[PDB]
């Protein structure tokens, strides 16, 4: 057997925190001895993983203090009064 590839990225990335499986637990006929994931290896994939996982009518009104529902029912009331 061989150990896994110790990658050293330039930027610390966000990671999923799984419960990892060491090589001492591995059986002979398992899936993870037969993993050949280096055929999926791409520097473009690592670059993307580093980059991602590092008017005729004026009717808008600015509400600095009031919320949306209180200003709506006030303008209903002021339009009626």
């Amino acid at each position: 057997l061989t150990p896994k590839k110790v990658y050293k990225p330039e930027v610390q990335l966000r990671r999923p925190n799984w419960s990892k499986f060491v090589a001492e637990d591995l059986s002979q006929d398992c899936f993870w001895t037969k993993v050949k994931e280096d055929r999926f290896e791409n520097n473009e994939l690592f670059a993307k993983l580093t980059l991602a996982f590092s008017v005729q009518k004026k009717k808008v009104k600015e509400l600095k203090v009031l919320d949306s529902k209180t200003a709506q029912n006030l303008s209903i009331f002021l339009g009626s009064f």
Binding site: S19, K20, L26, D38
Partner: protein, 293 residues
């Protein structure tokens, strides 16, 4: 509304055209003590003066060994329902284990997630990880990006949409996963041990039963034919559960996860939720590509 001698004749024949499960269930649940049955059997001379429940106890008191006989009759009429509850649980786990065993597009997904995830976990405790758990795959959606607009589930679905357009037919291969998401292995072991104990109790009843003094008494022939049929069906169920325990220990070796750290129902609920999350992630990535157009 049956006459009491007809109830005795159905019981002594083991009249299976008349006997049902809920009849014997209601007969046992309202049966008095055999000391009360023997005290009713001492007063057979005043049969016209006793009550209707008491006349039922006089007729039932003549039938010997009544409480283990009725429990053997109850286990006989519940044996067909107990096989039909235990066996499709075992077939659902065995078919889900065999579908996850070959599973080549999902195995290429497992190689792809481990390569991307070891680059993400580099410098951490999980650096150089040889494997990861299949039940953790729901939390690929929880691994979000820096802008919090796409997930690791959304990144791997977009990578399989771009680079390898054969990985995406994995979740239709998972067919018996949702049926195996509610199956408890300890309850299957407890029911089979209760089945093994009750077959031994009926076979002890059969062997301790005396000779039939009546031509109507077909208890000896019909129950021994049941014991020959139930020991055959339990040995079919014990071989299939041993095949279920071998395939669970094989996938315990294959995914290098411990058999005691997770049961069957939380195993395949996470696999069925990974099926629904990946189907959402492809449809969200197709919606995001149509929005950008």
């Amino acid at each position: 509304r049956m006459p009491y001698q007809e109830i005795k004749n159905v019981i002594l024949e083991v009249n299976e055209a008349v006997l049902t499960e809920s009849m014997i269930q209601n007969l046992i649940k309202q049966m008095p003590e055999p000391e009360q049955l023997k005290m009713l059997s001492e007063l057979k001379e005043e049969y016209d003066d006793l009550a209707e429940s008491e006349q039922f106890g006089v007729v039932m008191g003549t039938v010997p060994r009544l409480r283990p006989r009725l429990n053997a009759i109850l286990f006989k009429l519940q044996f067909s329902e107990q096989v039909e509850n235990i066996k499709p649980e075992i077939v659902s786990v065995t078919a889900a284990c065999e579908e996850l065993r070959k599973s080549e597009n999902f195995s290429s997904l497992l190689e792809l997630t481990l390569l991307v995830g070891n680059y993400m976990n580099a410098g951490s405790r999980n650096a150089g990880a040889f494997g990861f758990n299949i039940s953790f795959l729901c939390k690929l959606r929880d691994t979000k990006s820096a802008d919090q607009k796409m997930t690791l589930l959304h990144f791997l679905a977009e990578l399989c949409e771009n680079d390898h357009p054969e990985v995406l037919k994995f979740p239709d291969e998972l067919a018996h996963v949702e049926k195996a998401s509610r199956v408890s292995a300890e309850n299957l072991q407890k029911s089979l041990d209760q089945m093994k104990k009750q077959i031994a109790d009926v076979e002890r009843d059969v062997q301790n039963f005396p000779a039939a003094t009546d031509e109507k008494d077909k208890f000896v022939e019909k129950m021994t034919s049941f014991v020959k049929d139930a020991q055959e069906q339990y040995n079919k169920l014990r071989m299939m559960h041993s095949n279920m325990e071998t395939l669970y220990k094989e996938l315990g070796d294959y995914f290098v996860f411990d058999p005691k750290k997770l049961s069957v129902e939380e195993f395949f609920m996470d696999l069925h939720n990974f099926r629904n999350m990946f189907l959402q992630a492809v449809k969200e990535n197709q919606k995001r590509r149509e929005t950008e157009e």
